[PDB]
Homo-oligomer: A and B are copies of this chain.
Amino acid sequence: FNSLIMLSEEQKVERDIKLIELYSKYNQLIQSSSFNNEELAMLKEKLFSF
Tallying the copies of this chain within the complex gives: 6
| Residue A35 lies at the interface, judged by CB distance under 8 Å to chain B | yes
Q: A39 → chain B, closest Cβ, in Å?
A: 9
Chain A interface helix/strand/loop/mixed: helix
A22 at the interface (CB under 8 A from B): yes
Number of interface residues of A (CB under 8 A): 31
Q: Which of A1-50 contact B (CB under 8 A)?
A: 7, 9-10, 12-13, 15-29, 31-35, 43, 46-50
Q: Is the CB of B35 within 8 A of A27?
A: yes
Could you tell me the distance in whole angstroms from the C-beta of A47 to the nearest C-beta in chain B? 5
5 closest A-B pairs (Cβ-Cβ)? A12-B48, A27-B33, A20-B25, A13-B18, A24-B29
